[PDB]
């Protein structure tokens, strides 16, 4: 200390930090990167709940991103930016429980609402250091304090032998909760308001946010929630205790481990890469949009199934923003549904469609799988390849995202929550995936964080204006529980989603358009009829 | 003394009557016996051909209508009375009628044979809606309609018994068809161009003559208006026919042997049988009738579904279609919350209760499947939507989707198929507006009743009726409803499995549409059978 930037040195509960002054297109921001919030969950602490980071001495350098939690590296289209942008961009390590903070430069004088980002990645992948989650634009343009944390994924975050001491499960969610607690104690040192904390996340990150809504100890750590293209309810976000026990035991056998304590002791001796090499092999069926190690309904973090909790909980004090992208399902068809590729138009046959439905809803009986096929078939053109391709995408997107959030918006709204719903319909001019995928899963994030404002990124001017609109929507919601701008009047209003009117808005380059019904007919099939059909068969 | 009112058929001489139609006279021969009166020991028995008669038989007047139930729902309301018997009831009722132009045609003329509806429990060829004078006068057709036995007298069956073999009401129709072959040429008709057309149960009967091979040599073309041989109501299994007959016999005090049972039923006055007719249905129902054709293994060698799925229909041309609101008429006959005088705005609970009546064969899960399919999930409680959906459940389940299934199966297996939807509501209709275009109210337009100035139709409805008369008669002449003189687009395309094209019959010009309730009928025809099966 002495000759450095005095506006970049801050003290948190664990010691002193030195941040870095970053350039955003419109000015500087303060960045505090790689702050440790837990003891490294390594060695005998693998699979264990996180322990609070013990204080350090001296000034911790917080100028670069820290390790990415150990995870699978996608190799589907090697070197294709569509896949690589999601891949880890630092070293893989079990030592990975660090978080990041962006604030205005200099730091705000008055307490500023806080946004906490929870990344997605199917609970098997992801990192708070990816370019798509760059908090420098929200920090600079909106004056927000943004926090993002790494949490353990895959086996390290979610392998569970339910009821055991050494692998209780959901420790990846406990990693997230510990970071929320860290924001409670320390974010005031940066100018953030701990009494105005909004969680927002996407895909498994959105499901994570929803699970903090449903867990008691997490509810006192935040005040508002945004769930983008993900829900705690639905077919992929959770598994039963019995099913988590079987996948854990099977993976242990696949890595040579054949009493719970002896089992996890052996797992803790295996190299991390051994666990990643086998995690995908324990799914009960050939499937898309399902992940081996996800939150487990333990009777602890989750006292019951998410479906049961959103049916009975009280959410009057809660404001929630939820939505989907236009083509939630298309991204998943290229990862194992025959007939589908990023390099052709993926015009499939009726036979390929029927095979895809068995993969897309792998829990379905033969009768239930039929019911899906009859509903999604266009009976005036039942063999048309373009419709069959688009229907296969819609089946995956509706089943895993659109109808889960349509269900949760309705439940939360009926339990007294303030809900705002959107559909994101703009395809980025920079998108590298083919046209037939439309607006795929995850490609609204770069607009929420305001990447189009980076002039070196070749977005169009209207995409620059568009991203600024979304940034104001998201930050107005964090500030007020209401995405609408108080100053405005002429701009169309975003009404709350209600059971009586089921209103949502389209998010595209045109002004806000209000629509009614979130795929209402088709989601009645998924949310009301199909669960009753599955009991009978 | 009028020589064109005297015709000799193989049973002897007849004298008809000159009738006044708006454009000119017509020869009408009404009350021609085609069968021995099925009375006494001939009750429930197949018809026997009528024996020759001396002198000039007087064919000037409508004969008795077959003994049947007299509807009492809205007593004296024209909407219900127009279907009630308008001649005396009698088991002595096997007679047919013939309309020809006046003078009787020079060249042989294509014959249309009408088969009335009435749920196989009612109906008569003497109703005003079936007045054949307009088609005979305007289009120069030879029009024939017959009475056939309905209710227990037509279709109560002890399957396998000699005394009550079943389907005798259909045999009544077939005998009248043979009569047309042997005699219509004496009236100027062409026995080599005979077109059957009927509505509702009449349409179903037409479809069963398609599916019964001895009938097939008696006609060349068919029109099925708002009814099919396939579907949930038009037939019953032999086991269910024996159950219903056995319970009616017990209800009228008849107790063992097939022969002993049928004998006692023959000793019962007709009204006794009609009194308990309706109390033998297995469930509380709508659009279900107690005594209908039976899958006997004889007249119908298999279920109509099995027969349309495997038959050879190459040499066949068919016209098929529906009205816009097939099911609305049936709701006011037992569905709580529905009334002719009320607007029938129903609650959701009444809607769930109504679906169990409309699909009486449905398990709890199959009823929930229909409920969730037909609910409008943006307005799941709106009573106007729930009312209109109840009418659509009954209409699609019983008519529209059976029609679409038949049309597709016939077209796929050699037949030439033309399909329509009839969307005009008569300005003279007395049912409430919420019923729309109810089951059976295209008939008056096809027979040309608007051309009668005294019935107060609108002038466009007259032009409309003439268009429909030309579609039907051009179909009878050619197997193609398109006017060969008219040389403009749009033409009426055939219905195929691939394109699924049909036309809308309204006061606007013909409009071609593709897919006859395709998504919803996929539910009824493809999914629901599999569900009911595995439940
Ligand atoms: C590429 N990814 C981009 C993305 C979008 C949004 C948020 C975060 C990342 C979307 C995606 C994810 C997964 C798939 C296929 O499903 C998988 C892939 C890999 C695994 C792995 C690999 O070990 C383990 C597992 O349990 O389940 C998996 C399930 C396709 C597309
Ligand atoms: C009145 N009818 C008018 C009509 C329309 C189209 C063609 C012919 C007649 C349509 C109609 C028919 C039947 C009903 C209700 O269902 C019935 C009514 C009476 C019976 C009877 C009465 O004994 C016996 C039976 O087995 O089943 C029935 C079933 C409602 C509306
Ligand atoms: C698209 O490409 C994949 C992989 O090359 C292939 O399996 C699929 O059949 C292709 N589809 C079409 C319609 O060409
Ligand atoms: C933007 O375009 C320029 C040239 O037009 C190119 O050199 C640059 O790499 C592009 N940037 C991105 C992010 O694609
Ligand atoms: C409509 O009318 C009938 C008889 O007049 C009545 O029983 C029925 O309840 C009415 N419908 C409603 C919704 O009240
Ligand atoms: C037609 O209307 C007139 C009154 O304008 C009436 O006298 C006549 O009876 C009506 N005809 C019929 C068939 O109802």
Numbering used by the authors:
A (entry chain A): 1 to 258, 265 to 543
B (entry chain B): 4 to 258, 264 to 543
Recite the paper's sentences.
The synergistic inhibition of monoamine oxidase B (MAO B) and acetylcholinesterase (AChE) is believed to provide a potentiated effect in the treatment of Alzheimer’s disease. AChE regulates cholinergic transmission at the synaptic levels by hydrolyzing the neurotransmitter acetylcholine (ACh). Monoamine oxidases A and B (MAO A and B) are enzymes cleaving the Cα–N bond of several arylalkylamines (including xenobiotics and neurotransmitters such as dopamine) upon a FAD-dependent oxidative deamination reaction. However, few X-ray structures described the binding mode of multimodal compounds targeting MAO B (covalently) or AChE (reversibly), whereas to our knowledge this is the first study reporting the binding poses of two dual reversible coumarin-based AChE-MAO B inhibitors (1 and 2)20,21 on the crystal structures of both enzymes.
The structures of mouse AChE (hereafter indicated simply as AChE) were determined to a resolution of 2.6 and 2.5 Å for the complex with 1 and (+)-2, respectively. The electron density maps clearly defined the entire binding mode of 1, whereas in the case of (+)-2 only the coumarin moiety could be modeled. Nevertheless, the structures unambiguously show that 1 and (+)-2 have two distinct binding modes. In particular, as shown in Figure 6A, 1 behaves as a dual-binding site inhibitor occupying both the PAS and the CAS. The structure of 1 in complex with AChE shows nearly parallel arene–arene interactions involving the coumarin moiety of 1 in a sandwich-like binding with both the phenol ring of Tyr124 and the indole ring of Trp286. The coumarin C=O group may form a hydrogen bond to the main chain nitrogen of Ser298 (O···N distance of 2.8 Å). The binding of the coumarin group is facilitated by a significant structural change of Trp286, similar to previously reported for other ligands such as the oxime HI-6.33 The para-xylyl moiety of 1 is in contact distance to the hydroxyl group of Tyr124 and also forms π–π stacking interactions with the aromatic rings of Phe338 and Tyr341. The phenol ring of Tyr337 is slightly shifted and rotated to accommodate the tertiary amino group of 1, whereas the terminal aromatic ring forms parallel arene–arene interactions with the indole of Trp86. Likewise, in AChE, inhibitor 1 is fully buried in the protein structure, adopting a U-shaped conformation allowed by the structural change of Trp286 and Tyr337 side chains. The binding affinity of 1 to AChE is indeed 1 order of magnitude better than that of (+)-2, whereas in the case of MAO B the two compounds display similar IC50 values but compound 1 shows a tight-binding mode of inhibition.
